[PDB]
């Protein structure tokens, strides 16, 4: 997540590294897409808020977890910048791939450089 | 959604009826929680958009399916309002709980009144 267009995503202590990262500016949000639709993470950031605010986090089939966070809903997501590097950390409700019929709330940390 | 605080959720043709519905608003965003965390659906709508758009849907252990939709990418959703009644249609990616580990897409219809 130090090299450009790379990311690491940790979910309940399990990591995935990505070389596939695309950031877009869909006003007024910065959209960070890590991985693929099938397996990856999508983060929407409001960069014009001070401090910047995470509007949503969708983790899909990543480290055995899928989860969904929306600002105003259950869970949380906080962000910080280290130079170009975003860190987005929080909790998200969803389900573990092993047990899709049971609820899971996982702690996540996304480190990503566009 | 015939009467207030009710919902019907159909996933790949299999319907569940709910009398447990909670709705919340954070500025532009309307959040609709149907059922329970163990078996239910959570919807985030952006009402600032004209017309309103579905931001995300998290279906949990409902009609034998758990899965996610978020705006962007291959999976999509559409919605309309008729008076107090929301109708939301789309696809979600997740798992049929009969077959854990086998990625599955499902067509959903949510009709809900807060
Ligand atoms: Na999508």
Q: How many CB atoms lie within 10 A of CB A101?
A: 18
What range does the domain containing B19 cover? 1-114
The residue assigned the tokens 């758009």 is B53
Q: How close A93 comes to chain B (CA, Å)?
A: 9
Q: What is the DSSP letter of B24?
A: E
Q: How close B66 comes to chain A (CA, Å)?
A: 6
Q: How was this structure determined?
A: X-ray
User: What is the domain count for chain A?
Assistant: 1
With CB atoms and an 8 Å threshold, state whether B97 touches A98: no
State this model's resolution in angstroms.
1.5
- Catalogue the E-assigned strands of chain A: 6-11, 14-18, 21-26, 29-35, 40-46, 53-62, 65-70, 76-82, 85-96, 104-113
């Amino acid at each position: 997540a130090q090299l450009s267009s790379t990311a690491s995503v940790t979910v309940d202590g399990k990591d995935r590294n990505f070389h596939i990262v695309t950031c877009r500016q869909l006003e007024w949000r910065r959209m960070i897409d890590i991985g693929a639709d099938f397996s990856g993470a999508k983060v929407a950031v409001d960069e014009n808020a001070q401090p910047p605010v995470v509007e949503s986090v969708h983790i899909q089939n990543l480290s055995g977890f899928s989860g969904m966070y929306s600002r105003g809903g259950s869970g949380s997501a906080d962000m910080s910048m280290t130079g170009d590097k975003f860190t987005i950390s929080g909790t998200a409700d969803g389900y573990k791939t092993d047990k899709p019929g049971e609820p899971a709330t996982a702690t996540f940390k996304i480190v990503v450089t566009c």
